[PDB]
Amino acid sequence: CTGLRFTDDQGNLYFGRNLDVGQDYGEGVIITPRNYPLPYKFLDNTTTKKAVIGMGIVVDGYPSYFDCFNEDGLGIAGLNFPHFAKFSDGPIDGKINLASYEIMLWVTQNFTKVSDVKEALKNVNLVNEAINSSFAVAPLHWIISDKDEAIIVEVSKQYGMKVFDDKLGVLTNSPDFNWHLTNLGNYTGLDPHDATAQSWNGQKVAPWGVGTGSLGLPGDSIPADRFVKAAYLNVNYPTVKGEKANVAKFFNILKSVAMIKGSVVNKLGSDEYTVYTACYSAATKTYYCNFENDFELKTYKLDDETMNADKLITY
Amino acid sequence: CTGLRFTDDQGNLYFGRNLDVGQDYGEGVIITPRNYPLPYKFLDNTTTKKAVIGMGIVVDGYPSYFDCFNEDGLGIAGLNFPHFAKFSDGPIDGKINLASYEIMLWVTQNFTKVSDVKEALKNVNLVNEAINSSFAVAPLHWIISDKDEAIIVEVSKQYGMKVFDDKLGVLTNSPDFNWHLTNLGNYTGLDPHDATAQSWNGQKVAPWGVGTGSLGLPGDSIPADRFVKAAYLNVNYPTVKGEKANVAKFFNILKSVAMIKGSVVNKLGSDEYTVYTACYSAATKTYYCNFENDFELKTYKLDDETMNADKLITY
Amino acid sequence: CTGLRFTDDQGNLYFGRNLDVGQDYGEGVIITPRNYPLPYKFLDNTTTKKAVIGMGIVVDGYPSYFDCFNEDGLGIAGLNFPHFAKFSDGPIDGKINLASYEIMLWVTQNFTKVSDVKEALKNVNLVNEAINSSFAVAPLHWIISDKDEAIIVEVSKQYGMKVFDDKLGVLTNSPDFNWHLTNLGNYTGLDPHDATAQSWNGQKVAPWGVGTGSLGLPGDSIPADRFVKAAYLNVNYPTVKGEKANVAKFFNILKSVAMIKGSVVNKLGSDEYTVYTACYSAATKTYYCNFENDFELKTYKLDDETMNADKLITY
Amino acid sequence: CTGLRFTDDQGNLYFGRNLDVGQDYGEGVIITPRNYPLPYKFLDNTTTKKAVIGMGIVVDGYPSYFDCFNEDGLGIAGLNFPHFAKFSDGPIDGKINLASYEIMLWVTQNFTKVSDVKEALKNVNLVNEAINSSFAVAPLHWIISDKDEAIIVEVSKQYGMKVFDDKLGVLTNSPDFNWHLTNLGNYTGLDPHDATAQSWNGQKVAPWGVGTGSLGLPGDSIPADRFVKAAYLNVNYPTVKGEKANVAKFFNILKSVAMIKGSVVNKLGSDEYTVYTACYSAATKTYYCNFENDFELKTYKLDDETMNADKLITY
Ligand SMILES: [K+]
Ligand SMILES: [K+]
């Protein structure tokens, strides 16, 4: 998986992710309307303060999201964090206890500003518990963003719960976020500007085509390498104007770092690849997505009809 | 640029390209109908006998194509070949003399089989002449394909005219095609299969995520590096079923190797990037494209209406 | 810098380092004999009880070592650790307080087993103080080894004091040691075994020479890349027999990852390169070294003569 | 194998090679004195015009050299050239016919200047024949050098006989020399100057140590990779003064690109590694060498005693 966010020159947010997996979970776009029932394992059951949209599966009436985005422009995406993610054996007294899967709706329902999310997380404890005993607990970490800031939430056996400011606007998978930040120092030789003709002891050595300044940029799907490349592309991609250009920019970047079918076979013999790529535009409250076997952009919207529905809207 | 071709298991051809440039040239989709006037600089003037579709620019009624594809499922794309391409100073008696830009329509009008093209190219002479003196001659090389085979045509100062069978289904830019073929032997270490946990003198060393077998796959836009990655992806991408899946597979591959805006600045200070990606489906006579600033797939079609029109159709 | 240790099949230790710097420090080989005065900044002054040998400089009669090795087969090397190394403002009551430069002789004088060192370091506090006002405090970390185990000692602002078991037998520079261990997992695609001929959709793609399994092995001098390569080389180098063969193996590995003059120019305009390579053979109590401008191996030995001298012996 | 040459600022030549093979061949230093019997397969038998020194094997009184250097400062080294090298099926009338192994003494016996060698090679034909039936023909190419110029000689099935000027002063193995020269253009991003602190959207991204400018420099033993690194190191290594410093510079470069035992296993299960490194100093007529299992520099010299001996001098 790769998560990505950026804004245009006016603070309109574009935020989304590739889902890179080796199986079909049956996911689809789900709109959760306002005042929908919202049960919690360790908190008072309530109803939704806000409408949200995202990709997920419905389980006994509960919309379980891979990523979701609220009508007020705040979103979250859960990304695989294997060999690292580790949650509580059970709830802890005096903490806001959440089964890990509950963080998706806890964040998007209760907040609009990442600043408030960060303050609240100081008292959150994530618990190693699935929605029911028929599901395993996914080892995830999360990227959360509004128009001003993205943060990373990681709860690991190694380090406990850590929350990072993510000025790069990207996230991939293991290892931990600070490891990846540190890795970027090793790629400061990367330069968008082309090299030019040189004299190697009088032998002319000159580029054959453009792109020579990014010598050493990795193109494989190892999480560390997609992090380096996603960050490099995001920070150097110009700011563009308008919905179409910003959505295209977003898909240009994530399709660049997609996991291509056939090029990755896991130890069990299964292909792993980018099954979908999705972008939420906060400005238009529109969720854009396409799929490995269907490249046409599909669009779904939080609007008057959908946000005020009486039930979950599934597509 | 990157050209790409493959088929499904029924022999349906998908064939197209990224155009990587620093500039919008004002190009667009042009359908050239049957019976359209076709002058030549050295051959007899005639008319088109086959409808073609592709991206290009109209100059004084003449459609000058970046890529184009005839109704019988054979196509050609011209890609940048700097520091190599060089054509004859003039026509040569006894040869089929073509100003280099004329190869696009000469190929698509006169052939349905690449085996016929390869035979006729033995007596072809490309000439260093533009449609008129108000235009430069572009230093190009070409990939030509039908459902059965792709060939590369290169005319260089270094080696004269060479025609290669292209079983990899790909082409990028300089240097010459045999140089790139030879380069692939240096990447035989690439493996789609993940590595697994190792013992380095008792220290556990194990992958953090999937993708570790392709260690060393380059991710920059240097032509040689895009050639290795495009070829690697194409031969390992499985055969897929149906029009939507094959079109998506095509764009999955070419967007993976696209030149991302801001990540490449040429020596004159201009961004170079993939301005469009296009795919011709022979089976549906459909030209699909999207653009750097508009990601939605657009479709243009050779059908009874467009193939028999009285004029060039421009969109 | 790169530090390196391994043994033969009989537990004879070979342990040393490259010194990669951009200034001439006038270093030379120093033997400190038994019963030599040994002042401390915070501990009671004393005398040496074990002869040591290594490279360093003499300050006011004090041998300040880059690396040193005692007659009982235990040694230590200090390597640059910039942007990480951070020692305490002053001594802490209750701790064994050492100015950081004092760890060299404190380790080699008081210990013959790394397991005792590990235990004792639990009460050590390193202090940010140089030998005198005219010297800056060097931002170092250390590798310590006997014939059975190597440990890394790092004291950082980020993490405080950490002590690691170093099964890879290597150390370079920043960042911290657990970061480097973690990085190794991204290189599990490395394989000493050559690849063999492949068919890329019927195109024969085959190695031109040996070595194709180590595709992606980095050859630059970034510390993380020298760490990967040094570790890979050390753990895959066969065990060899005898002093000559083990010393050559040692220099083969370290010269492979040396920083070559002219290939690295620091931000101040100065060449940085491997000024010397040194190997201590515990079995023969011999210090072998050569220099950037003189490749002949020079040998210096802890002798009945030298170990019982009346003064420092400086070459 | 890697061949290497350079001069100091007085035109003093230092020229040598790594031999990278799977097993020791029993080779050793051989001095061939003046007036020594010199048979030829297809030329008149004669005696040596000059004394030469190098590494090789004596076969029935004939010194068969891996590299040899004459008393007037001209030398030659034969390196592996598999999948390319192809010599003529028998001698050709009108040519100077040499069994490929005979080029070693023919060049060093008959010439002082590389300019004269280049002119003479216009009439040379290399024949596919070994010294006798007990040996196979090795697929070799050659680097030849004096104080002014180095040339590469390659005779291939693909291109016939080619002679190149080698301003880089390096040679490795396959593919052909022009392929490698062309490859260098893809490494123009290499820069000895360190990168400096950067702001990635406000995130400080800065080097952890020196060496960041050479990002992407390959460190594996694939011939194309060692060629890039050897060329890069040689042209950027400063000119140094005096015999000791120049010999050390020479071993610094070649040991940097040595093939390290255990890191390369060919497809027949054999380790491949640098068995020796050797440097001929023309100014002192001294052959220096060390071996994988003995790092001490050994020295052998052409002087009045050895150049006027009455037999081969072996060591
Ligand atoms: K509840
Ligand atoms: K003869």
Residue numbers in the entry:
A (entry chain B), B (entry chain A), C (entry chain C), D (entry chain D): 2 to 316
Authors' account:
Bile salt hydrolases (BSHs) comprise a diverse family of microbial enzymes that catalyse critical BA transformation. Primary conjugated BAs synthesized in the liver, such as the tauro- and glycoconjugates of cholic acid (TCA, GCA), are deconjugated by BSHs to generate cholic acid (CA) (BA names and abbreviations are summarized in Supplementary Fig. 1). We found that Lactobacillaceae BSHs display a clear bias for either glycine or taurine-conjugated BAs. Notably, each monomer contains a loop that swaps into the active site of a neighbouring monomer within the tetramer and places amino acids proximal to the catalytic residues.
To examine the molecular foundations of BSH substrate specificity, we determined the crystal structures of six of the Lactobacillaceae BSHs examined above: four glycine-preferring (LgasBSHb, LaciBSHa, LingBSH, LreuBSH) and two taurine-preferring (LgasBSHa, LjohBSHc) BSHs. LgasBSHa structures were determined in complexes with taurine and taurine plus CDCA. We examined the sequences of these loops and found that taurine-preferring enzymes exclusively contained G-V/T-G (‘G-X-G’) motifs, while glycine-preferring enzymes solely contained S-R-G/S (‘S-R-X’) motifs. To confirm the importance of the selectivity loop, we first created two variant enzymes that swap the central residues in each selectivity loop: a V211R mutant of the taurine-preferring LgasBSHa and a R208V mutant of the glycine-preferring LgasBSHb. We found that both single-swap mutations significantly decreased the specific activities with preferred substrates without significantly impacting the non-preferred substrate. We examined the activity of LgasBSHa G23E and LgasBSHb E21G variants and found that they decreased activity with the preferred substrate without impacting non-preferred substrate activity. Third, combining these mutations by adding a G23E V211R salt bridge in LgasBSHa further lowered the preferred activity, while removing the salt bridge in LgasBSHb E21G R208V did not further decrease the preferred activity. Fourth, we created triple mutants of the selectivity loop sequence. Both the LgasBSHa-SRS and LgasBSHb-GVG variants exhibited the greatest reduction in specific activities toward their preferred substrates, with little effect on non-preferred substrate processing. Importantly, without altering secondary structure, the triple mutations significantly decreased substrate selectivity from 76-fold to 14-fold for LgasBSHa and from 353-fold to 2-fold for LgasBSHb.
